[PDB]
Amino acid sequence: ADLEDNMETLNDNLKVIEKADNAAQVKDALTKMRAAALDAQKATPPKLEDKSPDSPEMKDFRHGFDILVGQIDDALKLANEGKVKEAQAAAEQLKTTRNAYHQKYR
Numbered sequence: 001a002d003l004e005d006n007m008e009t010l011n012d013n014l015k016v017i018e019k020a021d022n023a024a025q026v027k028d029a030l031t032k033m034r035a036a037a038l039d040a041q042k043a044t045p046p047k048l049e050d051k052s053p054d055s056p057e058m059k060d061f062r063h064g065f066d067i068l069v070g071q072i073d074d075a076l077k078l079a080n081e082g083k084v085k086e087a088q089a090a091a092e093q094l095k096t097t098r099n100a101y102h103q104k105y106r
């Protein structure tokens with residue numbers, strides 16, 4: 001990963017969800033989100049670079065990727081069923097973990 005490109009891509013996919021009037025495009029974008037989260041989980045966050053080497057939190061800063069990717073799977077389960085709307089609604093919930101959790105770790 002770099003990190004920059006994975007973070008912007010997680011954002012870009014959320015932007016696609018604000019437009020995509022069909023479960024097709026909502027899902028195709030959200031797929032790229034999952035890929036970017038997977039690679040971001042393989043990156044080192046500067047907010048916690050000076051951390052302890054083996055800090056049990058840093059090691060598990062991953063918790064946000066686990067929580068976020070969890071909610072991405074649930075959101076994908078909406079549009080994949082055809083609830084493209086409810087996917088777009090719950091996309092606002094993904095924004096807490098990019099806003100709140102960003103304060104901790106960003």
Ligand code: HEM
Pocket residue numbers: 003004007008009010011012014044045046047061062063064065068094095097098101102105106
């Ligand atoms: C929908 C979920 C998320 C979105 C869309 C998002 C988006 C972004 C964006 C745009 C940036 C910085 C781009 C820039 O200023 O050039 C960023 C940076 C960052 N994010 Fe997120 N983020 C998300 C979730 C998360 C989560 C959950 C974590 C931690 C588990 C995290 C950790 C970070 C870190 C460390 C950076 C700073 C790296 C840098 O300066 O580029 N993000 N994110």
